Enzyme design. Structure first.
Site, PDB file in Angstrom:
ATOM      1  N   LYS A  97       0.849  -1.191   0.000  1.00  0.00           N
ATOM      2  CA  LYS A  97       0.000   0.000   0.000  1.00  0.00           C
ATOM      3  C   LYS A  97       0.885   1.241   0.000  1.00  0.00           C
ATOM      4  CE  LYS A  97      -2.899   3.352   1.058  1.00  0.00           C
ATOM      5  NZ  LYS A  97      -2.613   4.646   1.683  1.00  0.00           N
ATOM      6  N   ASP A 125       0.446   2.728  -3.733  1.00  0.00           N
ATOM      7  CA  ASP A 125      -0.616   3.745  -3.686  1.00  0.00           C
ATOM      8  C   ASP A 125      -0.053   5.125  -3.377  1.00  0.00           C
ATOM      9  OD1 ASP A 125      -2.542   5.545  -2.175  1.00  0.00           O
ATOM     10  OD2 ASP A 125      -3.851   3.733  -2.171  1.00  0.00           O
ATOM     11  N   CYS A 166      -0.050   8.634  -6.475  1.00  0.00           N
ATOM     12  CA  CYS A 166       0.018  10.081  -6.563  1.00  0.00           C
ATOM     13  C   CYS A 166       0.822  10.508  -7.753  1.00  0.00           C
ATOM     14  CB  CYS A 166       0.641  10.658  -5.276  1.00  0.00           C
ATOM     15  SG  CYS A 166      -0.403  10.568  -3.853  1.00  0.00           S
TER      16      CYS A 166
HETATM   17  N1  NAD Z   1      -4.405  12.088  -1.907  1.00  0.00           N
HETATM   18  C1  NAD Z   1      -4.096  10.754  -1.764  1.00  0.00           C
HETATM   19  O1  NAD Z   1      -4.684  10.018  -2.528  1.00  0.00           O
HETATM   20  C2  NAD Z   1      -3.163  10.204  -0.715  1.00  0.00           C
HETATM   21  C3  NAD Z   1      -2.540   8.916  -0.844  1.00  0.00           C
HETATM   22  C4  NAD Z   1      -1.737   8.419   0.277  1.00  0.00           C
HETATM   23  C5  NAD Z   1      -1.591   9.178   1.435  1.00  0.00           C
HETATM   24  N2  NAD Z   1      -2.215  10.420   1.528  1.00  0.00           N
HETATM   25  C6  NAD Z   1      -2.055  11.344   2.679  1.00  0.00           C
HETATM   26  O2  NAD Z   1      -0.920  12.158   2.426  1.00  0.00           O
HETATM   27  C7  NAD Z   1      -0.366  12.649   3.672  1.00  0.00           C
HETATM   28  C8  NAD Z   1       1.063  12.174   3.669  1.00  0.00           C
HETATM   29  O3  NAD Z   1       1.239  10.796   3.591  1.00  0.00           O
HETATM   30  P1  NAD Z   1       2.719  10.081   3.508  1.00  0.00           P
HETATM   31  O4  NAD Z   1       2.364   8.657   3.438  1.00  0.00           O
HETATM   32  O5  NAD Z   1       3.641  10.747   2.497  1.00  0.00           O
HETATM   33  O6  NAD Z   1       3.252  10.430   4.928  1.00  0.00           O
HETATM   34  P2  NAD Z   1       4.842  10.355   5.295  1.00  0.00           P
HETATM   35  O7  NAD Z   1       5.002  10.329   6.822  1.00  0.00           O
HETATM   36  O8  NAD Z   1       5.373   9.125   4.532  1.00  0.00           O
HETATM   37  O9  NAD Z   1       5.371  11.702   4.777  1.00  0.00           O
HETATM   38  C9  NAD Z   1       5.063  13.000   5.324  1.00  0.00           C
HETATM   39  C10 NAD Z   1       6.235  13.903   5.171  1.00  0.00           C
HETATM   40  O10 NAD Z   1       5.828  15.166   5.526  1.00  0.00           O
HETATM   41  C11 NAD Z   1       6.956  15.672   6.097  1.00  0.00           C
HETATM   42  N3  NAD Z   1       6.597  16.914   6.794  1.00  0.00           N
HETATM   43  C12 NAD Z   1       5.895  17.068   7.936  1.00  0.00           C
HETATM   44  N4  NAD Z   1       5.800  18.384   8.214  1.00  0.00           N
HETATM   45  C13 NAD Z   1       6.425  19.089   7.245  1.00  0.00           C
HETATM   46  C14 NAD Z   1       6.603  20.423   6.965  1.00  0.00           C
HETATM   47  N5  NAD Z   1       6.113  21.429   7.878  1.00  0.00           N
HETATM   48  N6  NAD Z   1       7.262  20.787   5.827  1.00  0.00           N
HETATM   49  C15 NAD Z   1       7.771  19.886   4.946  1.00  0.00           C
HETATM   50  N7  NAD Z   1       7.581  18.569   5.202  1.00  0.00           N
HETATM   51  C16 NAD Z   1       6.927  18.148   6.317  1.00  0.00           C
HETATM   52  C17 NAD Z   1       7.472  14.611   6.984  1.00  0.00           C
HETATM   53  O11 NAD Z   1       8.894  14.809   7.146  1.00  0.00           O
HETATM   54  C18 NAD Z   1       7.232  13.453   6.207  1.00  0.00           C
HETATM   55  O12 NAD Z   1       8.441  13.017   5.595  1.00  0.00           O
HETATM   56  C19 NAD Z   1      -1.274  12.111   4.712  1.00  0.00           C
HETATM   57  O13 NAD Z   1      -2.283  13.053   5.001  1.00  0.00           O
HETATM   58  C20 NAD Z   1      -1.806  10.859   4.079  1.00  0.00           C
HETATM   59  O14 NAD Z   1      -2.915  10.287   4.733  1.00  0.00           O
HETATM   60  C21 NAD Z   1      -2.975  10.910   0.468  1.00  0.00           C
END
Ligand code: NAD
Ligand code: NAD
Ligand code: NAD
Ligand code: NAD
Ligand code: NA
Ligand code: NA
Ligand code: NA
Ligand code: NA
Lengths: 463, 468, 464, 468
Positions: free
Chosen positions: A222, A226, A231
């Site tokens: 996942k 995904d 994305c």
């Molecule tokens: N739109 C979609 O279809 C989709 C798909 C998967 C996940 N998501 C969502 O996307 C978001 C991120 O998911 P992810 O799996 O990449 O999480 P992740 O933890 O793998 O990545 C998040 C990143 O954001 C960074 N971060 C946090 N605060 C920050 C800031 N102020 N400035 C710059 N970077 C910062 C963190 O360092 C982290 O590396 C969540 O809300 C998640 O649920 C959305």
């Protein structure tokens, strides 16, 4: 006559059935799951409340669950993500669904409530959740019901006050102890996404989580498909359909370089943008830099980029003072969570001019404008069609196996699926895209210390 | 009081105007051209008949021409490429337009003819053409008017029969000599695309071309931007909108590796497909190979690719025998020309099931199906929104300059009844107009450096022979 | 019993022969040209003076020319580009070759003069040139020879002083009318590269070009393959062998977005650099911007970039003032022409510390340093092995056809390019080796788009 | 006259010193560690035995260790990977090193032996290992010691009978029980690479791990940078230097799509190859497919690919059957481990013609030929210069901090005879040490943002199970 649904236009069902048929061909994980478990009915007796984007891909999940024996109620987990013909197809199949593309915040929460009044009486007994809204309603209602009620009067954003109001209405309206009744019957929740999964761990950490949870998000099949390749496909789809802008020659800014930021950055760079990235994590920042992205602060990017995407899971990433600095007609959107990555609320006393659904022009006092997509909610689902079916088959095969785990095969903590199931998810998708997998001979298996049939990596392996 | 238009819904005018405004920002060449030549009204007295996809981008071009003084009538040059809010907005501006997404072939050719019944009477005195349809309407009617009518009396395609039926109707319904009247009044045509320009050169070669022509396609700032980067952005846009299919993991086949084929293979590669290519030209073939694409025949690719794109400008590229061999639910589409790159006519005994506008499922006798986009007509314009505005600003700035050249810069008859291209200094000018918007900073040759390479500081910087 | 050559280590001949063998497999077009024209012997009676980088790939060209009947003398056209084992192998095959990796500019010009003293007497009757230096020698001696000697006292660089000294020498040592004799005997010149083709066109336009010429550079199958893909493969090769730096994470600056600049920018981008580009040409600048490069000036880049590459063919691209602004241990190199794209002359009084051949660290008085590759000459040939054999098969098939055209096959004292059908033929000769299967038009289809089934497929103005 | 080194040439020391100085600038992590820890002398009393490619990058590590207080002895962990000028510079620094590019297998293991005779007698107290050879020496000698020796008399490869007859010679020649003496004084071992660490995990699992161990390969700032980006930079470097072959237009085959295989496929794809990939792990296969690589079996690839690279860590990836089926002058090389990914031994009776060091042409009975790089050993170190300095700075700052943990921060005995990893905050610190050199500007979390995502502002920012 069937009455227990709410959708934009039931007439759209044939169109939705058409796209579901095409999606089935693109979702071999789900179809192979149907044939494996259909016969075995492992969800027979499940009452699955589902809160997750009512897309064509979710319709295919829904009918998989129903093919495994599950009784279903469904809502979208985002006000703009429903695909009305998918929802129409589900409703026309006799499954209660309450999902409209462009629902109001109040309707969004009212519909979530509808998940728990099961048809024929009683509650759900499983939750399948994306972003955790349904689980959160159960937990807030349970905590108010135990007597801790002052928190519902805590002032908040608009959505937050709609939610508190919903809990107050359910307490006033449902019988004494409704939430405890639900909490009791919920055998498990499987959670789709990083944000919702983080909420689950914080509650498991405070001892405040009411039933076991499977983190579907951090299946490798996942998180690293995904969140990454989903994305990579769907972010630029959203931006193009919203704006039809040329990406070649543009500068884009991605905040966050986790799985979603990596895929997002890649989406924009493959589409021809020169991409900059921000990060707070020095390892992820170093990953971005080694991939050739310039890594900068949002203050740095604000006057430079043509396109801004928040991908952090965090709040207050793009603020009023960044947007004040942007070039006229910069494009701003969010692919991470909720609507608080961008400071949408601080924009609500500027002139907003709607261009078309989920595309608005916001004018500042000095006449410069920005183009806001989906009012700061998920742009790939809001402005386009979300991730394509094939990668959703991976995620939703995980979801189906997680529901089988929690409803058949767990204590009140947050678990991931075993790695041989994760590997199984991958295996189910290889033939569709022409992969020919090699098999270890026994001496080669022994040489690297693995079984021929896997698992091939330790639980610590990062891929 | 204005009724001289045909559009799907004039009520889409406000939506169309909003996107037109957004597009002006993305079209600096066209807007700068308004600013420079606006006060000079170089097209005052011009009566420009345009046959070019009625998109939001074309609307900015149309308003640029009117800003320069031109009177205008317009039609789309494909039955599926009109953007109905763009058409609505133009008609609401008072400009006659006859453009509907999904018009029939019969409606299509009747609208083309409406170009030439100028409002107030008379004919146009300029053609702005994409694919040469309006130009062919004039030349074919002229030929027939001369007494050489044999060719009308049976065609070759359905559209050739509709088209000839039109010519017959016009010979009866329009005054004697009307095609000579038109050809006399037309001072020039500027032609947008490869297929249409090749027609012009062949007619010039045979001495049948009735008025001066400018090949806009082969401006550098057109063919190596529009055809190349335009398709790179808009091909997968159209495939995505029509099918929502995951491209990563999929094998795609592109026929042709000219500018469109190069941009189309990049489009699919950049989206995550493994892309193969067919070519007949050994130089283009070797370019495809050196860019890492596997170069195979359609027969090789037919049973194995997930996605098929014709990009040749030729016919009979994907045949019924190819489609018979394709895997179930293969996607087939065309971004080159007409609708005979794919043998769509050979499918009309099979069960078509319409999925949504411009998306059909075709089912074969053996239960195998294919997914056909836009009935085999230009997928980027039919399934999505065509090229984006910024690159069309380059194409359309060239168009505007070419219209100025033939309408206002031909008193000495510098343009005979041949096919010309704009001078390099204008082509470089088009490029210069687009640099600041995307933040490019150009270097200026020092005087010594300019002398060193044999060029003026102000350009032109390359020989006329340079291929970029 | 040959000693009519100069090479660094003739004992490298066996090793050059082994890599020549390997390259033959990689050069289908040259080998098929050998096979097809060899029995025709179209170059029998030709005496080819070649001035072109004495690499393994050039050895396969030289033996192709000999296999078509040519008598040959050869030099390298750059002082760092010779591959000493390829030179040894050609010397050991009995062909006069004067080429050493690291020869000086003095030697360089002495060797070029050795082309024109043909073994057994006489002059050459063809020139195969790269950058125009052998051509220039004939023209300069011929102009001074008939009277205008005053330009020879006016050199504007040290290399020009050495070249003019050579002309003086010859004019005094050689028999009177020697350059008029050479000029009369030369039937043509075929010219490899943009810069040298720049020189011919301007001599033609001024009516001073002494014999016909073929612009080989602007074969489609040269300029859009060699200049583009060749540089894409070999620019980063040269930077890696000279410095062994990590490219991922670094910022690079490429001056120029012609074919070489396009290839170079792609070389560094593909290796992992974030690449910026300068251009004077608004069309080439727009192409760069559309391929995702930030298009900036050298002054914008100087304090920023980790790596700088000149690819313009122009002069004074990277100046002393740019180098003074560079970060410490920035890498600077040229893949364009001579050594005047970088102001190398201006660094001559800074402290130079040689690291290894073609790698120098230059200290400024403020103690900041830059890494200079190949003393600002062609870095892919200087620091690595030039383009790889396969793309060079394309260029050299064009060279070989141009030599045939001018020698055996109307050609005025102008600059001509090969006909499109030969250009197409070059490309055909390279398809089967890389597994390309060409589609054949049905007559139907050929008629529809206006072409003969067998080509050519495009009009002469087509830009590919 | 300090006498205790074995190198190819001492006279190369100055050239080695010039490139070490260049490398320091490219290694901000090591230099930062030097400056911060030099004063603290955290490894005074340390006696590190190092078995790790004697490259320019290793030399900076060695001097770093030396600057933090360490007494040092070194060997290379591959016969072809030594860079003679780095070795010469280290030797000239007065450091016992025994490393020659192109050493025998008998000299290699005898050098590895010279590690444990500490100058002035006695034993090392720290092992810094790449591949675990010096580790398994201690262990295979220790087991030998108080009982089991029946395994020594049972070869495997030629490098295992040599390894056993070496273990024989120490038992014989050292005091009785000296292998126990060594395992006693060794406070810890840090292990650089995937193959080594799994051998640590197989041994700690068995209860036969004799001292603490830090798995350095699985700091994120090693495995996800070095294994990946290191091979992405140095695979094609090795191949270019060995063969000067054009990569655009070629098909390459990469066995394995772990971190090294991901790096290797990308190296070849970015250089212009069409890359195919084999895998046994369905997840990594699915990742390759999604990145656009055709995923096939080696039997499928063997007749097709121009270039083969093994990247698995496993044995018998390319066998005599595959090589027999390859096309003439296919290129074959290995970047994983040892030299048993390719069945080199199966070629031992064919004609080998040496092109140049580490490049051989092998001729089969049927006169078809392959080009073998570095005799099947690590191609990036045998044919080029290994990973570049910047990425070895990340690996080697981890190594340094691992040596500080096992020698300086084990007083409470927090490290037992198990295999550990460095804390995430230290892994994050390695990354921070390399950001400024490459111009990364990190954002700072505000407290409410850090609370929101459940992290301290200062990190660690991800859970221990996060995969990056
Ligand atoms: N739109 C979609 O279809 C989709 C798909 C998967 C996940 N998501 C969502 O996307 C978001 C991120 O998911 P992810 O799996 O990449 O999480 P992740 O933890 O793998 O990545 C998040 C990143 O954001 C960074 N971060 C946090 N605060 C920050 C800031 N102020 N400035 C710059 N970077 C910062 C963190 O360092 C982290 O590396 C969540 O809300 C998640 O649920 C959305
Ligand atoms: N859809 C768009 O938005 C758009 C944009 C520009 C041009 N076009 C159109 O696309 C078509 C192509 O234009 P172009 O500019 O690339 O022309 P081109 O002359 O540059 O390229 C066409 C290529 O097709 C190859 N070809 C011809 N027959 C073939 C066959 N049977 N199989 C495989 N390859 C074959 C040719 O060798 C040639 O290289 C034209 O019809 C043009 O009008 C469309
Ligand atoms: N090293 C090699 O193997 C190799 C291969 C092919 C050609 N070359 C040589 O490379 C040079 C360039 O070749 P080309 O084929 O790309 O020529 P080109 O004409 O195609 O490109 C030169 C470009 O430099 C640009 N330019 C000129 N002055 C500039 C300035 N001051 N700043 C920025 N840009 C400037 C021009 O506008 C032009 O686009 C020539 O000297 C040619 O002989 C070298
Ligand atoms: N030369 C270098 O500079 C360098 C750098 C780092 C690691 N390494 C070495 O490279 C090797 C691989 O390291 P890694 O980090 O990629 O480990 P890994 O565990 O991350 O990856 C190895 C992959 O090979 C696959 N595999 C095993 N047997 C296979 C078979 N018969 N066919 C196809 N795939 C097979 C596995 O499924 C696995 O995904 C190790 O030996 C390691 O020591 C070398
Ligand atoms: Na979708
Ligand atoms: Na558009
Ligand atoms: Na070479
Ligand atoms: Na190195």
């Amino acid at each position: 006559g069937f009455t227990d649904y709410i959708v934009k236009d039931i007439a759209l069902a044939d169109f939705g059935r058409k796209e579901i048929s095409l999606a089935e061909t693109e979702m071999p994980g789900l179809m192979a799951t149907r044939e494996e478990y259909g016969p075995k009915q492992p969800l027979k007796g499940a009452r699955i409340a589902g809160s997750l984007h009512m897309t064509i891909q979710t319709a295919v999940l829904i009918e998989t669950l129903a093919a495994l024996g599950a009784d279903i109620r469904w809502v979208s987990c985002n006000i703009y993500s429903t695909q009305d013909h998918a929802a129409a197809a589900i409703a026309a199949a006799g499954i209660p669904v309450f999902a409209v593309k462009g629902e109001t915040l109040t309707e969004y929460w009212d519909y979530t409530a509808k998940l728990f009044d099961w048809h024929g009486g009683g509650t759900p007994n499983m939750i399948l959740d994306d972003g955790g809204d349904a689980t959160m309603l159960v937990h807030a209602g349970y905590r108010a019901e135990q007597g801790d009620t002052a928190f519902l009067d805590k002032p908040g954003s608009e959505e937050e006050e709609i939610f508190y109001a919903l809990v107050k209405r359910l307490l006033k309206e449902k019988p004494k102890g409704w939430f405890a009744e639900i909490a009791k019957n919920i055998k498990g929740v499987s959670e789709e996404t990083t944000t919702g999964v983080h909420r689950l761990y914080e509650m498991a950490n405070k001892g405040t989580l009411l039933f076991p949870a499977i983190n579907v998000n951090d299946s490798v099949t996942k998180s690293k498909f995904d969140n990454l390749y989903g994305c990579r496909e769907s972010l630029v789809d959203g931006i193009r359909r919203g704006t039809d802008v040329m990406l070649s020659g543009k500068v884009a800014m991605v905040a966050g370089f986790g799985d979603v930021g990596k895929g997002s950055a890649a989406s924009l760079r493959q589409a021809g943008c020169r991409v900059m990235v921000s990060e707070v994590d020095p390892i992820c920042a170093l990953q971005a830099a080694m991939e050739g992205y310039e890594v900068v602060t949002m203050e740095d990017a604000a006057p430079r980029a043509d396109i801004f995407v928040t991908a952090t899971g965090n709040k207050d990433i793009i603020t009023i003072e960044h947007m004040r600095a942007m070039k006229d007609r910069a494009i701003v959107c969010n692919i991470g969570h909720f609507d608080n990555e961008i400071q949408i609320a601080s924009l609500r006393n500027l002139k907003w001019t709607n261009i078309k659904p989920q595309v608005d022009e916001i004018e500042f006092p000095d006449k410069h404008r920005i183009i806001m997509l989906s009012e700061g909610r998920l742009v790939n689902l809001g402005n386009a069609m979300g991730h394509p079916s094939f990668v959703m088959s991976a995620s939703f095969t995980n979801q189906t196996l997680a529901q089988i785990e929690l409803f058949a095969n767990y204590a009140k903590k947050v678990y991931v699926l075993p790695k041989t199931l994760d590997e199984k998810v991958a295996r189910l998708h290889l033939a569709k895209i022409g992969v020919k997998l090699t098999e270890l001979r026994k001496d080669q298996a022994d040489y690297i210390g693995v079984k021929q049939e896997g698992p091939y990596k330790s639980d610590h392996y990062r891929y």
